[PDB]
Design a protein around this ligand. Structure first.
Ligand SMILES: [Mg+2]
Ligand SMILES: [Mg+2]
Ligand SMILES: [Mg+2]
Ligand SMILES: [Mg+2]
Ligand SMILES: [Mg+2]
Ligand SMILES: [Mg+2]
Ligand SMILES: [Mg+2]
Ligand SMILES: [Mg+2]
Ligand SMILES: [Mg+2]
Ligand SMILES: [Mg+2]
Ligand SMILES: [Mg+2]
Ligand SMILES: [Mg+2]
Ligand SMILES: [Mg+2]
Ligand SMILES: [Mg+2]
Ligand SMILES: [Mg+2]
Ligand SMILES: [Mg+2]
Ligand SMILES: [Mg+2]
Ligand SMILES: [Mg+2]
Ligand SMILES: [Mg+2]
Ligand SMILES: [Mg+2]
Ligand SMILES: [Mg+2]
Ligand SMILES: [Mg+2]
Ligand SMILES: [Mg+2]
Ligand SMILES: [Mg+2]
Ligand SMILES: [Mg+2]
Ligand SMILES: [Mg+2]
Ligand SMILES: [Mg+2]
Ligand SMILES: [Mg+2]
Ligand SMILES: [Mg+2]
Ligand SMILES: [Mg+2]
Ligand SMILES: [Mg+2]
Ligand SMILES: [Mg+2]
Ligand SMILES: [Mg+2]
Ligand SMILES: [Mg+2]
Ligand SMILES: [Mg+2]
Ligand SMILES: [Mg+2]
Ligand SMILES: [Mg+2]
Ligand SMILES: [Mg+2]
Ligand SMILES: [Mg+2]
Ligand SMILES: [Mg+2]
Ligand SMILES: [Mg+2]
Ligand SMILES: [Mg+2]
Ligand SMILES: [Mg+2]
Ligand SMILES: [Mg+2]
Ligand SMILES: [Mg+2]
Ligand SMILES: [Mg+2]
Ligand SMILES: [Mg+2]
Ligand SMILES: [Mg+2]
Ligand SMILES: [Mg+2]
Ligand SMILES: [Mg+2]
Ligand SMILES: [Mg+2]
Ligand SMILES: [Mg+2]
Ligand SMILES: [Mg+2]
Ligand SMILES: [Mg+2]
Ligand SMILES: [Mg+2]
Ligand SMILES: [Mg+2]
Ligand SMILES: [Mg+2]
Ligand SMILES: [Mg+2]
Ligand SMILES: [Mg+2]
Ligand SMILES: [Mg+2]
Ligand SMILES: [Mg+2]
Ligand SMILES: [Mg+2]
Ligand SMILES: [Mg+2]
Ligand SMILES: [Mg+2]
Ligand SMILES: [Mg+2]
Ligand SMILES: [Mg+2]
Ligand SMILES: [Mg+2]
Ligand SMILES: [Mg+2]
Ligand SMILES: [Mg+2]
Ligand SMILES: [Mg+2]
Ligand SMILES: [Mg+2]
Ligand SMILES: [Mg+2]
Ligand SMILES: [Mg+2]
Ligand SMILES: [Mg+2]
Ligand SMILES: [Mg+2]
Ligand SMILES: [Mg+2]
Ligand SMILES: [Mg+2]
Ligand SMILES: [Mg+2]
Ligand SMILES: [Mg+2]
Ligand SMILES: [Mg+2]
Ligand SMILES: [Mg+2]
Ligand SMILES: [Mg+2]
Ligand SMILES: [Mg+2]
Ligand SMILES: [Mg+2]
Ligand SMILES: [Mg+2]
Ligand SMILES: [Zn+2]
Lengths: 62, 104, 103, 85, 208
RNA sequence: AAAUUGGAGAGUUUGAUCCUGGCUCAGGGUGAACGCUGGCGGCGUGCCUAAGACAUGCAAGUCGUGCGGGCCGCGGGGUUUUACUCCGUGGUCAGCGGCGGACGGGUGAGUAACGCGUGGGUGACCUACCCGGAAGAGGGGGACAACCCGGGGAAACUCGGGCUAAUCCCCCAUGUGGACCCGCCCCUUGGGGUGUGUCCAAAGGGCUUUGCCCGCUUCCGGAUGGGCCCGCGUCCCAUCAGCUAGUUGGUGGGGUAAUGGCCCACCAAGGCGACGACGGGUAGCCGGUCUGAGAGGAUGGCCGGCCACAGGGGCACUGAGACACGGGCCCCACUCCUACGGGAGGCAGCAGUUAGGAAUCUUCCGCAAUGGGCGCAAGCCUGACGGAGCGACGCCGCUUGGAGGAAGAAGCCCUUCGGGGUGUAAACUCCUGAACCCGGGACGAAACCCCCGACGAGGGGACUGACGGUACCGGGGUAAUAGCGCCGGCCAACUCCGUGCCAGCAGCCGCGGUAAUACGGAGGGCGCGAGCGUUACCCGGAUUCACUGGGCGUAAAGGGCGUGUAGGCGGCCUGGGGCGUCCCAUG
RNA sequence: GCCUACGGGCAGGCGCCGAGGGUAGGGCCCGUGACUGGGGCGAAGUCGUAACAAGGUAGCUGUACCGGAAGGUGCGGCUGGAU
């Protein structure tokens, strides 16, 4: 089991995803995170800050 | 230089051959104490001349049998059973040390 | 469906078989003929055993000059054969011919 | 057969060779018997060829047939030249 | 690349004058002359005491910023300076000062260190008769650092050498104003350079 | 491994405190991958996984100056029905023969081993081609391909008959010399000499033909490359403690270049193990590399050295050399052809296909260079190699401007409404001129060869560039990519707004339940910059396996107590030995 | 059977060793897995209240028996037991 980071996602019963290292202290038995923006894991929409850590590409006209 | 070691006879029981027990001291590669490791060499005795308890010199040699790669070089000092005892008792104790069992 | 050709490799194999045969022949000639030798010495026939031992000796040296044996490998068998013969005419009587043997 | 040949030691587009004695069969840049001077084909320096004659002379004296470019370089430092009358 | 961006500002973050600018860094305009506090919304507010890291860090930056230079080029020199027989604190500055970009500025061909890097890179500089345009090229003693025969006529080239009318050049250097040549004589001993840096703090920052 | 050149810590158990102690972080590194971003060059470097399967193309040939002939032709001759036939010659094909194919290239499966490292031994040995020295090449005969003729098979291929050349094969002679038995002399494991007996050589080709060049034979030494053997070093588990019967030794015999249970026969009952045998697990080893104050840990692609394998397992044949990756024979598994009798194949060579995977490149150029094979040479071959291509994968270098320019426009942000901030930043002024345009344009390449000279030395001459119209030079010439992490503490960087134990952050302690410097956005700042972060892994921090350098009354830790085996350790004086130890010289 | 110089050679035939396979019988290591043991957890509730104060029967401990469990008692031991 893998944490899905980000304010809101789109994961489902057959989503193909990619996972990395990184535990979550609050959720025990979770020693992997899901990488966002690869396979079937969208980047966060609307994210304007730590974007590379959430697969969001740099928006124009900002 | 063909190697030359010095050691003691611990075995008659072979045809034209003796077991020689050779000691070597050296400082421990990390803890630097001097440690006393040892080895057994099988040495060609073409004349039975060397008896057990003999300290002998032994020399690197054209291969004799599977294990025999040394010839007995000369006698250093004969009659020296204390050493041989230490070999045998070290051996005897091995039959303890087991796990199939022991006695009283 | 075409086993790609390597003309000069096969040619080598072609030759190897040729040689193999030539080599067998010389070798075997020695075997049976050296056997002829040692046999006829155990029947104390020094006029004949040495007659052979020399034809044996020659045939041996010939397959050395070629590539059937090594100069040592031949030499090895000459020592087998010759000594194995002298030490068979102990068990009998004097070396007639003189043959290939020295006294 | 032993040879006297060149072993490349430069970079890419920076060939720097090394004159050497080695068994015919070894990798162009492999374990070599003895080094006998360097050679720099681009002549980036006033000293783009050294040889150590007397050694090379020794090795030729026991028949270390040298490659063609090597004979040339050897010849140039006069490994072969005699004297006088 | 190298740092391009607003400078009288680092002038201000370091709280001392870096002379990154040029003709006005000397005038009543360096904003150190007008707003000696650091940039940003908060530079007005009273400071917290610096951590040891803080002081070690900033003293590094002050020195580095003075000289142009990327941290990767900077650290690599401090590295080289430690591998030297010498007092690395000093050896470092000597190495820094050996940069063509810098040698040129110290020579007085360029108004500033930044302007100097262009003068180099756009090919306006001779080193020993030849062209050089790497601002990182190391000048050794005995080197002659000239203006290109071509670029001899620039306004700033001539305008700057006319300030040399009344400046005099560093003690480890020699200027040939008329001939537009300068010679690099020896490495500057620590006492020649009078930067506002505590080199030792830099060293300390790197031994963490 | 030549200045003692070298050594930083912090958070977290409590209401507080000191100690113990674990957790965690900052550093450096990568054959990396993933996110956001991505302008240029130089040098490196790029299947870590399935040692899975592989379409296609190339990857080792060469010599006509060893020898005969087929096919297609050219000339030029002699001649019995105008058919035959002699000579020279071009092109092509393979065969016989010599040399190479054992090097070069790939890979890391296996292997914990004399495999590797390191130092030695070989009186126990081999070594094609090269080098030096000594000697010789005299007679005679012989077979198989090619080729012609004929039969089996679907194919792959295959059997039979007949002709024949050679540097191919074979017998006789000379034997300088060598080999073998036997005896003697020195030496000492099978070393050197010596004496009778025996036994052993050879090949021819080319021309600038009464002597030069290439090759042949036996032998002695050099040279180089290998076989074999021994000392020492070589990971984890004792919750693997006993292992072994060709096992351990002998005598004889076989085999080999040579020692040896390496193999075989007979005889003896040995061999190894707590200094860890045997068993299980894991791993190619090193020069080095990463880290570290060191000591140590970790690692061994790329370069170089050794090893091992070439779809799994056997096996030997040719030969100087293999038990041979692109050689052979058999078994198995796989794939394809098939007329169901049978046959074909082996990228862990270069490039590429495919699967697997987080992930790893062009079916490119060139034989100009260096190196290798064959050749008298010209040359042929060479996916060795020299280069280009693709990938910020790494390091390094370069750019996106430079100078001037307000008590400081706008917009955005904060505001105590006074003002503060971005910010000389922008605008705007001058200056420079990456890109790009035109022109020139490389070094790497001078030998092989040919000529003079002697075939030597030495001198003269010509041919040859993949990269590449590249680098570099000269002239012209445009202001001309910036992004990413971070801002509660460690830790450089602070404000507003939204949100309200939600959404979320989170390496650790923790944050968020209406004033959040910790979530999210914004302004502002810090840190690096064609890069920045993330994950994974090594070393560090971790004196947290403590050799350097730790402990055990209560923190984890003294065996319940004794006896005593192996082992470890051990008083005072004198003398010998010189093993440890220390010093010098040398390899 | 083939060749021959009559010395012998070649094909072929047999035999040992032998990869591999067959039958029986052991030992070992991974894949899956019917049925199961507790255990640690993890949101604040059930029924107790054993321990911490002499915790309201001083506490702990080995070993027994009872109890589903917490615990109770027996026999010793310890003070790390309060006036
Ligand atoms: Mg290039
Ligand atoms: Mg070799
Ligand atoms: Mg506590
Ligand atoms: Mg607290
Ligand atoms: Mg450090
Ligand atoms: Mg890192
Ligand atoms: Mg992209
Ligand atoms: Mg693959
Ligand atoms: Mg691989
Ligand atoms: Mg193929
Ligand atoms: Mg020839
Ligand atoms: Mg013709
Ligand atoms: Mg031909
Ligand atoms: Mg190889
Ligand atoms: Mg094992
Ligand atoms: Mg060695
Ligand atoms: Mg040969
Ligand atoms: Mg030969
Ligand atoms: Mg010779
Ligand atoms: Mg001669
Ligand atoms: Mg026939
Ligand atoms: Mg011949
Ligand atoms: Mg002798
Ligand atoms: Mg003869
Ligand atoms: Mg003839
Ligand atoms: Mg037996
Ligand atoms: Mg024997
Ligand atoms: Mg392995
Ligand atoms: Mg340390
Ligand atoms: Mg080290
Ligand atoms: Mg290792
Ligand atoms: Mg390699
Ligand atoms: Mg390697
Ligand atoms: Mg394969
Ligand atoms: Mg195999
Ligand atoms: Mg091969
Ligand atoms: Mg092999
Ligand atoms: Mg292959
Ligand atoms: Mg490939
Ligand atoms: Mg896939
Ligand atoms: Mg060549
Ligand atoms: Mg290459
Ligand atoms: Mg690049
Ligand atoms: Mg990337
Ligand atoms: Mg850079
Ligand atoms: Mg304002
Ligand atoms: Mg400006
Ligand atoms: Mg202009
Ligand atoms: Mg050229
Ligand atoms: Mg030239
Ligand atoms: Mg010339
Ligand atoms: Mg040529
Ligand atoms: Mg002439
Ligand atoms: Mg051009
Ligand atoms: Mg220009
Ligand atoms: Mg211009
Ligand atoms: Mg612009
Ligand atoms: Mg930090
Ligand atoms: Mg701070
Ligand atoms: Mg965040
Ligand atoms: Mg934070
Ligand atoms: Mg925030
Ligand atoms: Mg901002
Ligand atoms: Mg910013
Ligand atoms: Mg440690
Ligand atoms: Mg200690
Ligand atoms: Mg402790
Ligand atoms: Mg306690
Ligand atoms: Mg305790
Ligand atoms: Mg006690
Ligand atoms: Mg106890
Ligand atoms: Mg004792
Ligand atoms: Mg003692
Ligand atoms: Mg004592
Ligand atoms: Mg004494
Ligand atoms: Mg004494
Ligand atoms: Mg002494
Ligand atoms: Mg001593
Ligand atoms: Mg010592
Ligand atoms: Mg079997
Ligand atoms: Mg209670
Ligand atoms: Mg109570
Ligand atoms: Mg009660
Ligand atoms: Mg009861
Ligand atoms: Mg009681
Ligand atoms: Zn300023």
């Amino acid at each position: 089991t893998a944490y899905i980071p980000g304010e809101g996602h789109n994961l489902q019963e057959h989503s193909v995803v990619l996972i990395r290292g990184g535990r979550v202290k609050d959720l025990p038995g979770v020693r992997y995170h899901i990488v966002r923006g690869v396979y079937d894991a969208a980047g966060v929409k609307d994210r304007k800050k730590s974007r590379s850590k959430y697969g969001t590409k740099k928006p124009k006209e900002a | 230089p063909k190697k030359v070691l010095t050691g003691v006879v611990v075995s008659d029981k072979m045809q034209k051959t003796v077991t020689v027990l050779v000691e070597r001291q050296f400082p421990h590669p990390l803890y630097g104490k001097v440690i006393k490791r040892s080895k057994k060499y099988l040495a060609h005795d073409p004349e039975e001349k060397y008896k057990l308890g003999d300290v002998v010199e032994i020399i690197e040699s054209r291969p004799i049998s599977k294990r025999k790669r040394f010839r007995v070089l000369r006698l250093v000092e004969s009659g020296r059973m204390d050493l041989v005892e230490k070999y045998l008792i070290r051996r005897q104790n091995y039959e303890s040390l087991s796990k199939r069992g022991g006695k009283a | 469906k075409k086993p790609k050709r390597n003309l000069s490799a096969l040619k080598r194999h072609r030759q190897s078989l040729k040689r193999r045969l030539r080599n067998k022949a010389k070798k075997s000639a020695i075997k049976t003929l050296s056997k002829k030798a040692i046999q006829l010495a155990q029947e104390g026939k020094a006029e004949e055993a040495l007659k052979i031992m020399r034809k044996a000796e020659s045939l041996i040296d010939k397959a050395a000059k070629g590539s059937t044996l090594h100069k040592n490998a031949a030499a090895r068998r000459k020592s087998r054969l010759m000594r194995k013969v002298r030490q068979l005419l102990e068990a009998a009587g004097a070396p007639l011919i003189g043959g290939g043997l020295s006294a | 057969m032993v040879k006297i040949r060149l072993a490349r030691f430069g970079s890419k587009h920076n060939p720097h060779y090394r004159i050497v004695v080695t068994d015919a069969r070894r990798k162009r840049d492999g374990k070599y018997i003895e080094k006998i001077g360097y050679y720099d084909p681009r002549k980036t320096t006033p000293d783009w060829l050294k040889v150590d004659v007397e050694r090379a002379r020794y090795w030729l004296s026991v028949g270390a047939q040298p490659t063609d470019t090597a004979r040339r370089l050897l010849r140039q430092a006069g490994v072969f030249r005699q004297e006088a009358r | 690349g190298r740092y391009i961006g607003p400078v009288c500002r680092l002038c201000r973050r370091e709280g001392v004058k870096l002379y990154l600018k040029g003709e006005r860094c000397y005038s009543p305009k360096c904003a150190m002359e007008r707003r000696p506090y650091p940039p940003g919304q908060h530079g007005q507010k009273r400071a917290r005491r610096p951590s040891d890291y803080a002081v070690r860090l900033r003293e590094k930056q002050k020195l580095r910023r003075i000289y142009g230079i990327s941290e990767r080029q900077f650290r690599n020199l401090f590295e080289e300076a430690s591998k030297k027989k010498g007092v690395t604190g000093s050896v470092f500055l000597g190495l820094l000062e050996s940069r063509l970009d810098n040698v040129v500025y110290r020579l007085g061909f360029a108004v500033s260190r930044r302007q100097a890097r262009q003068l180099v890179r756009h090919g306006h500089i001779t080193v020993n008769g030849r062209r050089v345009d790497l601002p990182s090229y190391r000048v050794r003693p005995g080197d002659e650092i000239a203006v290109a025969e071509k670029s001899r006529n620039l306004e700033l080239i001539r305008q700057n050498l006319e300030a040399m009318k009344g400046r005099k050049v560093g003690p480890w250097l020699s200027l040939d104003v008329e001939g537009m040549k300068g010679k690099f004589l020896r490495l500057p001993d620590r006492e020649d350079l009078a930067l506002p840096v505590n080199e030792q703090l830099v060293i300390e920052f790197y031994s963490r």
